[PDB]
Design a protein around this ligand. Structure first.
Ligand SMILES: CCCCCCCCCCCCC/C=C/[C@H](O)[C@H](N)CO
Ligand SMILES: CCCCCCCCCCCCC/C=C/[C@H](O)[C@H](N)CO
Lengths: 44, 246, 192, 270, 270, 246, 44
């Protein structure tokens, strides 16, 4: 499926480049310093 | 081993006997500016002792029918200490912060607070006027309150047209008067430019809205204060010239 | 390449005494000689140089500048100057104690009759739009001032009035982005 | 950092009868989202999930065209439009979901007539960067476009389309700016410059009909912007209040619209 | 000769306390630019510069189209235009920045009507080299173009575009010629041939409407030239005075425009 | 290769085309305080860019019948720049200096100056009174002149009972109007304690006494100024607290 | 990015050829005969 092909020297005129599935939910859901387990009481 | 804590930064220390955690804002530590992201040529200064310490502001009374308070973070410290002198003589500023909001109460008081940081917390002008030149705008002592803070008029919309209910997408904590008494956030330097002035642009802002208002019985302590202590972690300045107040 | 600035572009300068900074002997100390803005995409002395006509074709510039002062005077006339660059902030300084708080250079008229003040790249953004005035005072570069450091001392039978020729150029890290058209050329009808 | 498609599948679980292992009791006072999952609460079965999450990235969410501005040309002879995409509340809210954004663009120009038609005339679209002189007439010298990028297209042609790079002096576009652009004595009554980021002023977009006399038509060109190669930072809540101004987040003091519709009681789901 | 992109980065420097090493005292009487750099004057830090200088070559600076001439056709039946690009002050000043230039060209022909429209007629563009006979009518025998290059294009077509090579008898185009084309007794009163380089006369450009009777329209064709494969030599200062003539650098004796705007005093930056 | 010189310190440079040398005071360089000689426990700050640069004072006219001038060295810079802010907010101070006194004149003027540094240059009170409580003492604007200097009343005894003839046991130079026009001294930190306050104690002091008074013929330049530029080499501060002017 | 491709025998009808970063500023800034150092006095 040739779609990435460009026709100019400027790289900002191309299509939607490689789709990387990067996902780091640990920075919005668990930002606390001390790593808490999920099978124990949060505050001992 | 999780509720007692001590936070020594500089010649100041903070002791507490019941906290919950220390939320790390966006899971990142306050760092120094690398040589890759830097753009200014002049060498920056780093006091590293006199500016990285806990500055304590005045106390805010927590009345039963309170609305909330908000502070700008590089602007509360411009006349206090060596940090204000450094951020008045220099022109560029980059640092992270280390928050701590204390509100102690007995085991017969109830209530809660939502403390959070809001990057680029822009204050909206209240009033129905869809005309560019006739619209109302907030004053200078409302956008930049200073070290005495500023109260909310409509805490339900954060005075910016944004729901408070979904204001938990920000680095935040709660002060539940039955579990903890202190909320602390370690926020890094969040900006679109590597360096920025500490007099025209306020990076972010703390908000403390009292949800589930304070309640108690007769005979208890009525005066319930609220104290916050800031620490400018990893401060560095650049562009030394004449000192400008504002 | 160095290129004479029009620092004397004030009124009452006739045709060619607009390139000269008059120097003479004073009676009060700490006096001031001249002052001009740094912005090369701005109306003023930089409009008469070669880097301020090339940075007017482009709507952005970056890097350090360079100002070279040459002293055209008698061989027996000594003296010292304090040329000082000041990053943005307040207005032009009023005292020499305020001016010496920036990045100055102490140049003395000797056998070498030319000094060069490099203007470092002290900015927040990577680039600066070469169009100041209005809401574009966010891209100002500062003020270069030249002060009567000690005095202009002259022996007898020698003229007590000289001139300094200011020149300006770019540096090694100078660069430009986004071409445009200058505001100089005006044409009503075709050139028949 | 984990990189995977589909969706996290579940695992088989049995009942637990013991003390000290409590996955359900969380503590929201720590500012952390609860981490209790399906398997630990209830007895579950094993499933292999194949429900692709490719359509939920911030690069498939923004890579959709959308009206940014409309330019009414009466034929003064010409018409201008200061480039600012915060004028229509459909693409403004998705961009204001985030604080900082870095992206390329792709504008599409759709020009129609008063009653709606396409007469075979010629149009010149000219982009005026900050600092370039704006044209003062329909036959001025600014239209010679010796350096400004221009597009010559007819009304009977397909809609024009160009690609625009990241043209900001900062490292990203910020929509919310908590400060002033200049120094000095700021007033208490009318702060007409608070929350005005100078890194977003991109210039002026001008349009004229290429002719010598005056063409008797009232045109209307719509600018459709599409985002691509977009990166986003520092998410923030989505606005619930109706918009009033264009460059300011002003809302209405009275008649604040609640973020949830009313029901009869609190003990009646429906 | 050094070949590199980006921009020269800076290096860390410390303070110097010694005699005999003075990088600041230059001498402009030698006709050489000062070579003092950042590191030697002030204490500096280390930076890696990435600000690309690709857009500052003389091949990206000139490879931009631009109006060179306009040809009014009344329909005498035909119209001619002597090829000389020094008629509009926008592309004339960039080319007169240099003394010698060697380049290829690319002309674009944009033809409109009186009020501005495109009627489906036919046009013939014919290039007449120096020595070829110019046409004397709209139905003459010169239009048979058995050897001259011609373009047949309609008004409803896209603008025509051809490529033109380096067609000079010398090795480069010179804009300034300090001499006379011929020998003999030159006059003291009216030197109407001084500064006239014969190596730049390229011929005549003619245009007609291909028909038999007379078409009742007043056209106007604009020639847009773009330079490419351009080499430049011997740079010279850019002109500050307003242009008066087309082939001569005449200026005005009185009301000489100063190259810098006036201010109040010499001790007031603003 | 000996008369031309350039002294780049910070964002400031000093160019000269005819000097003689650069005397190094007591043959030693300004260093940082080692861990052996240090006694304070708090970590010191080091700007290293904003305070180590050439500050230029106002010019002093050199009249024919002039007597001389003197300045205190850690006290001339307490209200100017970032160095004054650092030496007002902090409590301890240690740095060396880098002197430069310029006085240019034509080849038809004659004269000379003696510029020198005097460690612990104590100003004496003038007057014959051998009674402890009735004796005269110098004012505060005479012991600590500030940035505007102070003139001598008896330059022959240096206003301290000490002969000027034998004041060449100090780091010094001459400004002979036929040979040079600039005298520069690089003085290290000379004190009996490792750190000392920069508001109560003035380490040393420059003196410029015009021996062989200025002489010229009619038609020459009369106004002959004298300009001095200081550079606080290797400055470090300690003991951050509230700012005290004096 | 195929752009250099031509479609005629004449080479002057192609696109913008290879971009060489040639730069010799030493002929406009320092044209003197005797090479002067930058850390010494120009005229000894
Ligand atoms: C005539 C054809 C070319 C037209 C060029 C128009 C595009 C130039 C403007 C770039 C737009 C960048 C995207 C929006 C930028 C800022 O976010 C807006 N000012 C938002 O206020
Ligand atoms: C009808 C289609 C082909 C049209 C051919 C026209 C081009 C032939 C002329 C070549 C132009 C070369 C560029 C300009 C040459 C000289 O510099 C000008 N005379 C400047 O005065």
């Amino acid at each position: 499926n040739f779609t990435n092909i460009n026709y100019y020297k400027d790289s900002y005129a191309a299509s939607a480049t490689r789709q990387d599935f990067t996902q780091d939910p640990k920075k919005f859901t668990q930002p606390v310093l001390d790593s808490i387990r999920e099978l124990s009481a949060p505050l001992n | 081993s999780d509720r007692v804590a001590q936070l020594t930064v500089g010649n100041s220390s903070i002791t507490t006997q019941e906290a919950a955690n220390i939320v790390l804002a966006y899971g990142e530590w306050p760092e120094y500016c690398p040589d890759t992201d830097a753009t200014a040529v002049d060498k920056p200064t780093r006091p590293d002792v006199s500016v990285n310490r806990f500055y304590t502001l005045d106390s805010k009374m927590w009345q039963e029918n309170s609305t909330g308070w908000y502070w700008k973070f590089p602007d509360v410290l411009n006349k206090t200490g060596v940090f204000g002198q450094n951020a008045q003589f220099h022109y560029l500023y980059r640092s992270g912060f280390c928050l701590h909001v204390q509100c102690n109460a007995s085991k017969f008081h109830q209530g809660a607070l939502l403390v959070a940081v809001i990057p680029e917390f822009v204050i909206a002008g209240r009033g129905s006027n869809t005309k560019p030149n006739e619209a109302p705008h907030p004053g200078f002592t409302t956008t930049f309150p200073g070290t005495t803070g500023a109260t909310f008029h409509d805490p339900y919309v954060l005075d910016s047209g944004v729901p408070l209910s979904q204001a938990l997408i920000y680095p935040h904590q709660w002060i539940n008067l039955r579990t903890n008494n202190c909320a602390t956030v370690i926020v890094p330097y969040i900006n679109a430019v590597p360096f920025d002035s500490a007099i025209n642009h306020s990076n972010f802002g703390l908000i403390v809205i009292p949800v589930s208002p304070l309640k108690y019985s007769s005979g208890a302590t009525t005066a319930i204060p609220i104290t916050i202590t800031i620490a400018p972690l990893n401060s560095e300045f650049g562009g030394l010239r004449q000192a400008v107040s504002q | 390449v160095e290129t004479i600035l029009e620092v004397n572009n004030t009124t009452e300068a006739t045709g060619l005494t607009r390139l000269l900074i008059p120097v003479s002997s004073q009676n009060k100390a700490d006096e001031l000689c001249a002052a001009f803005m740094v912005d090369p995409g701005r109306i003023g002395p930089w409009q008469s140089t070669l880097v301020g006509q090339i940075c007017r074709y482009y709507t952005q510039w970056s890097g350090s500048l360079k100002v070279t002062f040459m002293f055209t005077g008698s061989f027996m006339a000594t003296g010292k100057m304090l040329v000082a660059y000041s990053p943005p902030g307040s207005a032009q300084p009023a005292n020499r104690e305020t001016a010496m708080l920036g990045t100055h250079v102490i140049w003395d008229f000797g056998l070498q009759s030319s000094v060069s003040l490099v203007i470092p790249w002290i900015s927040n953004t990577h680039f600066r739009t070469a169009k100041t005035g209005g809401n574009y005072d966010y891209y100002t570069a500062g003020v270069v001032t030249l002060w009567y450091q000690t005095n202009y001392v002259v022996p007898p039978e020698t003229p007590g009035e000289a001139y300094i020729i200011a020149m300006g150029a770019a540096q090694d890290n100078f660069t430009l982005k986004i071409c445009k058209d200058t505001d100089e050329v005006t044409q009503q009808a075709v050139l028949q | 950092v984990t990189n995977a498609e589909s969706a996290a599948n579940t695992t088989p679980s049995s009942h637990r009868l013991e003390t000290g292992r409590v996955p359900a009791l969380q503590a929201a006072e720590t500012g952390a989202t609860s981490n209790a999952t399906d398997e630990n609460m209830i007895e579950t079965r094993c499933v292999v999930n194949r429900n692709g999450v490719l359509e939920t990235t911030i690069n498939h969410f923004f890579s959709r065209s959308g009206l940014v501005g409309v330019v009414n040309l009466t034929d003064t002879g010409y018409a201008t439009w200061d480039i600012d995409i915060m004028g229509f509340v459909q693409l403004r809210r998705k961009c204001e979901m985030f604080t900082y954004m870095r992206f390329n663009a792709e504008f599409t120009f759709v020009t129609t007539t008063k009653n709606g038609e396409a007469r075979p005339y010629m149009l010149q679209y000219m982009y005026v960067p900050p600092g370039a002189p704006k044209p003062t007439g329909r036959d001025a010298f600014q239209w010679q476009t010796a350096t400004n990028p221009s597009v010559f297209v007819k009304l009977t042609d397909p809609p024009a389309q160009v690609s625009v790079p990241f043209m900001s002096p900062a490292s990203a576009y910020q929509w919310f700016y908590d400060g002033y652009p200049t120094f000095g004595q700021h007033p208490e009554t009318s702060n007409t410059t608070y929350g005005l980021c100078p890194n977003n002023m991109m210039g002026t977009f001008a349009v004229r009909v290429v002719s010598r006399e005056a063409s008797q038509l009232k045109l209307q060109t719509r600018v459709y912007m599409k985002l691509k190669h977009v990166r986003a930072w520092v998410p923030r809540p989505i606005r619930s209040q109706p918009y009033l101004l264009k460059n300011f987040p002003n809302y209405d003091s009275s008649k604040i619209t609640n973020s949830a519709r009313d029901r009869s009681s609190i003990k009646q789901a429906n």
